[PDB]
Write a protein that binds this ligand. Structure first.
Ligand SMILES: NCc1ccc(-c2ncc(OCC3CCNCC3)nc2-c2ccc(-c3cn[nH]c3)cc2)cc1
Length: 164
């Protein structure tokens, strides 16, 4: 069994003094790490909202997560959407405007969390136009929350559904 733990990184809030363009228990953004022979390694990032943990399926792979002294366990997942919810139903209903700029709360493995302001690229799909946020970040950054101007989570770094 892989020893997967989550650790709180910071609060999830829109950053007003944020850098624009592209230079590339408790609510918040968590690092997802598993204990190794050398040490822990960061494999993903998750969003804690309303007592439910949200992360990418590929990061967790369905494995049980250790938070504090309690084991937090999966409730729902979608492999096609690469989404997994722990302890409760998916709580992230936020949608992108399609026109407004967004901030990515990044969590490079081994790096302070930072908010980066960028405009997502818009591409058509059979299921309706989608926004793509692609930057030069490590893999372990996967699951990093994408927030709108209201500070709601509109996407996970990996894919930004827009509703208008
Ligand atoms: N690992 C990155 C990744 C990115 C997007 C998707 C993805 N692929 C296909 C797809 O089809 C749209 C369906 C929606 C339900 N009707 C059937 C078509 N969707 C996605 C996707 C969309 C949104 C999100 C998402 C991220 N945060 N919140 C939702 C993740 C994956 C899968 C992996």
């Amino acid at each position: 069994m892989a020893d997967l733990e989550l650790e709180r990184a910071a609060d999830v809030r829109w950053e007003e003094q944020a850098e624009i363009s592209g230079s590339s228990l408790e609510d918040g953004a968590y690092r997802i790490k598993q204990k190794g022979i050398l040490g822990y390694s960061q494999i993903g990032a998750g969003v804690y909202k309303e007592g439910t943990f949200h992360t990418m399926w590929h990061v967790t792979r369905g494995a049980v997560l250790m938070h504090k002294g309690k084991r937090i366990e999966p409730s729902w997942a979608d492999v096609k959407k690469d989404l997994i919810s722990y302890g409760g139903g998916w709580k992230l209903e936020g949608e992108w405007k399609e026109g407004e700029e967004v901030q990515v709360l990044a969590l490079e493995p081994g790096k302070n969390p930072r908010a980066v302001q960028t405009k997502p690229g818009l591409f058509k799909t059979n299921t309706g136009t989608i926004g793509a946020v692609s930057l030069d970040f490590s893999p372990g950054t996967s699951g990093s929350p994408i927030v709108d101007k209201k500070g709601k989570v509109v996407g996970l770094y990996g894919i930004a559904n827009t509703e208008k």
